[PDB]
Amino acid sequence: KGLEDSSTISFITWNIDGLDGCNLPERARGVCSCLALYSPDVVFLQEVIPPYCAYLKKRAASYTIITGNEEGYFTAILLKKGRVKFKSQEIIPFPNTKMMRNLLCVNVSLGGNEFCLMTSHLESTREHSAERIRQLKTVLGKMQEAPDSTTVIFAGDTNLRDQEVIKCGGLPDNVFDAWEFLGKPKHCQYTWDTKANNNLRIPAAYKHRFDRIFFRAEEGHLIPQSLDLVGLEKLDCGRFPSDHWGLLCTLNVVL
Amino acid sequence: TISFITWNIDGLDGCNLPERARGVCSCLALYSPDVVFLQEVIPPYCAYLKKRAASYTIITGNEEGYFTAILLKKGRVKFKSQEIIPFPNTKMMRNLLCVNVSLGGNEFCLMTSHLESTREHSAERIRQLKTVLGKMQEAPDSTTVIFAGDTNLRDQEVIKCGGLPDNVFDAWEFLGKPKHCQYTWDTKANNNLRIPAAYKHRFDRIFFRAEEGHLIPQSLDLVGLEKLDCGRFPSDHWGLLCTLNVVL
DNA sequence: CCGAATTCG
DNA sequence: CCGAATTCG
Ligand SMILES: [Ca+2]
Ligand SMILES: [Ca+2]
């Protein structure tokens, strides 16, 4: 990452299924091999557990880890050392979660710009649609509260169905979904796919765009450049790093 | 002056079913209504009614599984025809059962249904309600239309549906929303489902369309409120007894 | 047939 | 962690 790429932020967002203990160390090494290949500035992770933090400190030592909780399972934001200056951590609760979910925010400077970087793992399953929608509103409300000079990026596992974003009232006028921005490309549309991914061993074909990237920037100051899936290679154990595909995204920050 | 009972009699609950069926009819005997709208009837229950209620003409919504029925008191009600309207996307064999009848010079179209069940099937239930309301509008203006049945509705779903049309009224609302007969399915007062919690809903509803003011609800009461010898009620639902006057 | 929880496909 | 069918409190 040299002079030319200095105006770009690159990141990966990925629910890495830390609650599946089977093959977890090898699957962590798989995630870390992906981070080594693309060397993203930032990594947004969901379903991290404490042993997984240890694996990351070993196989992704060039990242500072900021976590959404101390025990159970939680999100984390990883920051590339020497590229990202960490300014503060903020955690916003979801008072009605039944699954210890919350909103993790990290304030940083990168490439000579101020960012508020957000992630969450919104309430899971169709049956908890109401709370998931309430949490999305909390997220979208927080994105709007940041100073107008700050660049806000949310990236996480939203567990959203399309009908739910409408029921939520659609995205506010100044908040954009990166996948939509890039013209809804088919190659990275689905991030959870039980036909293509066998980690859950579900004997049926269902697929969802659970993982999403939202951003709020002053008119034209933040331009998504690319969006691609990662984590599609089977590991030596014959499974994938996670039941989710990860998303690799690059964005330019423009005057 | 006409009377009727509408009641989901829970024919799919096999426990104490003979005693509960006899319990339902003991209740019908007490009030001897002109018309009875039933939901969740099963074939042997239907077979029972043809004997026990042999004094009623019995019209059914199906022959198999579970289904609705409309009983018409011979002498009082003249049966002219039955019509069944399908719900193409039902997953529960639900449909719309109508009968054309007269009492004196007064023509009626009487309708019942058991709308798609459970919170998860709200969207189909709403679609079925639109079909029902649509049908109510088709009758001649001189024909009095009454729907009475188990709608499984939540109030929000009626709103979602667009609300009742200007010329269709809910009898319970018309009577000023009396508290004593508001909830027709109540797990606190009713123990048949053995649900260890308190939920209550107004699932059973009466809708009518008449030329302005021709049909005036007079009373509405719950029935089936007494435990049977087995310590359970005739059904998990209360029945609704309604009396209305035809005013020309 | 409530909401929540559970197996198995 | 899908979703339909089933069981539980
Ligand atoms: Ca998971
Ligand atoms: Ca029933």
Side-chain angles (χ1 to χ4, degrees):
Chain A
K1 187 183 174 181
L3 178 50
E4 177 167 357
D5 299 313
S6 283
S7 66
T8 90
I9 181 170
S10 65
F11 64 87
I12 285 171
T13 181
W14 205 349
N15 177 323
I16 50 70
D17 197 7
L19 292 171
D20 174 14
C22 193
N23 311 109
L24 192 62
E26 177 187 318
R27 288 165 40 227
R29 291 194 289 272
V31 166
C32 289
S33 74
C34 179
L35 307 185
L37 179 60
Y38 295 111
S39 185
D41 300 312
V42 176
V43 190
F44 302 91
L45 300 177
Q46 306 88 40
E47 281 192 41
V48 186
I49 61 167
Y52 207 98
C53 291
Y55 304 148
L56 292 172
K57 290 193 192 105
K58 176 181 192 67
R59 293 302 232 270
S62 74
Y63 290 92
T64 302
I65 304 166
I66 310 292
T67 57
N69 240 333
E70 317 186 343
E71 55 190 332
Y73 69 100
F74 44 80
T75 60
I77 299 179
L78 278 52
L79 309 172
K80 175 69 77 173
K81 298 172 193 304
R83 291 188 207 159
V84 183
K85 185 164 85 176
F86 169 70
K87 293 193 292 176
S88 76
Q89 172 196 43
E90 181 173 38
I91 296 171
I92 284 75
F94 295 156
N96 296 294
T97 188
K98 299 178 190 305
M99 303 182 195
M100 302 303 292
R101 313 303 172 74
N102 58 23
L103 176 58
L104 173 63
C105 311
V106 179
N107 299 294
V108 304
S109 65
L110 172 61
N113 292 276
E114 311 316 303
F115 293 86
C116 180
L117 305 177
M118 297 166 51
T119 192
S120 182
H121 177 193
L122 302 190
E123 212 82 348
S124 311
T125 77
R126 184 204 279 175
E127 286 61 45
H128 292 101
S129 180
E131 171 63 8
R132 169 164 57 256
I133 290 166
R134 294 193 289 263
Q135 292 175 3
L136 175 60
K137 287 174 178 165
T138 298
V139 168
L140 291 174
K142 177 58 178 179
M143 294 183 72
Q144 284 170 330
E145 290 167 10
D148 299 354
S149 57
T150 303
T151 298
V152 183
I153 301 169
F154 172 92
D157 180 3
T158 72
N159 270 314
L160 287 167
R161 285 78 173 155
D162 273 17
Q163 208 73 7
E164 296 176 336
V165 176
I166 299 170
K167 275 193 180 65
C168 201
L171 294 175
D173 271 12
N174 57 341
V175 174
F176 304 85
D177 177 314
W179 178 75
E180 298 184 343
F181 183 92
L182 292 161
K184 298 187 177 177
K186 299 284 187 291
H187 72 274
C188 60
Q189 178 175 357
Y190 299 111
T191 62
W192 186 92
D193 176 351
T194 62
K195 189 171 193 182
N197 186 301
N198 64 5
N199 273 38
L200 285 174
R201 292 178 182 88
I202 290 165
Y206 295 107
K207 50 190 184 177
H208 287 280
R209 186 170 77 88
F210 284 157
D211 306 271
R212 307 192 181 194
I213 295 151
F214 307 141
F215 60 92
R216 185 214 77 173
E218 276 178 334
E219 58 202 292
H221 291 12
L222 190 65
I223 310 296
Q225 301 291 307
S226 63
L227 190 62
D228 297 288
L229 301 178
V230 297
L232 275 56
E233 300 289 3
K234 273 182 182 168
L235 304 177
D236 291 341
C237 64
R239 309 174 74 222
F240 299 95
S242 169
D243 61 319
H244 293 243
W245 310 135
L247 287 168
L248 170 71
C249 181
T250 62
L251 317 172
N252 288 352
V253 196
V254 174
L255 296 177
Chain B
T1 316
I2 68 184
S3 62
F4 67 77
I5 288 174
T6 182
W7 203 353
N8 177 325
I9 49 71
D10 199 357
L12 293 168
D13 174 21
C15 299
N16 316 99
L17 187 60
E19 190 181 321
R20 285 168 41 231
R22 298 186 284 263
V24 162
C25 290
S26 289
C27 298
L28 298 183
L30 176 65
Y31 299 114
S32 298
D34 298 312
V35 178
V36 182
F37 307 92
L38 300 177
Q39 306 83 41
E40 286 198 41
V41 184
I42 59 172
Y45 204 121
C46 189
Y48 171 67
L49 293 175
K50 285 178 177 173
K51 289 186 183 181
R52 178 83 170 97
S55 50
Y56 286 75
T57 301
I58 300 172
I59 306 307
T60 58
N62 222 314
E63 327 175 347
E64 286 275 48
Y66 61 103
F67 44 83
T68 56
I70 297 176
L71 293 73
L72 311 169
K73 187 191 272 184
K74 299 171 178 187
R76 281 283 292 167
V77 183
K78 182 181 187 60
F79 174 65
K80 303 181 107 88
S81 70
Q82 60 172 89
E83 180 171 20
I84 294 169
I85 296 173
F87 293 153
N89 296 125
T90 183
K91 290 170 182 183
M92 300 177 192
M93 306 309 301
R94 308 309 168 73
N95 58 21
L96 179 57
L97 177 60
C98 318
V99 295
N100 298 307
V101 309
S102 52
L103 295 88
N106 300 321
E107 300 291 343
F108 289 80
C109 179
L110 310 172
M111 302 168 42
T112 194
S113 183
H114 177 195
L115 300 191
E116 210 84 349
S117 309
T118 78
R119 190 180 59 182
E120 286 59 38
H121 292 100
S122 175
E124 171 63 10
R125 173 166 52 253
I126 289 167
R127 290 195 297 267
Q128 289 173 1
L129 177 58
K130 291 188 183 179
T131 300
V132 173
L133 296 173
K135 175 63 174 176
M136 290 183 76
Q137 301 293 350
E138 283 174 24
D141 291 312
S142 60
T143 297
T144 296
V145 189
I146 301 172
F147 172 88
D150 181 2
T151 72
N152 273 313
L153 287 162
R154 287 73 170 162
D155 285 15
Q156 179 53 45
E157 298 176 330
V158 175
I159 297 168
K160 215 168 176 296
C161 199
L164 293 175
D166 292 333
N167 65 337
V168 170
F169 301 83
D170 176 312
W172 178 76
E173 296 181 343
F174 181 96
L175 289 172
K177 300 187 178 178
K179 283 181 174 55
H180 70 263
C181 64
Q182 179 173 7
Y183 299 110
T184 60
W185 189 90
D186 187 350
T187 63
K188 189 183 179 191
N190 188 297
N191 68 334
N192 281 35
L193 289 181
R194 293 188 273 275
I195 295 171
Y199 301 95
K200 24 185 170 244
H201 290 270
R202 186 169 70 88
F203 284 160
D204 304 87
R205 299 188 183 201
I206 296 155
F207 305 141
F208 63 92
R209 195 213 76 185
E211 312 196 80
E212 271 62 301
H214 270 246
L215 185 70
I216 304 123
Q218 299 293 320
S219 66
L220 186 67
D221 295 282
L222 302 176
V223 296
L225 298 171
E226 294 195 24
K227 275 177 171 180
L228 300 169
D229 293 326
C230 60
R232 309 174 73 229
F233 302 92
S235 175
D236 63 318
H237 291 244
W238 311 132
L240 284 175
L241 172 67
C242 185
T243 69
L244 314 91
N245 294 328
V246 186
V247 179
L248 313 177

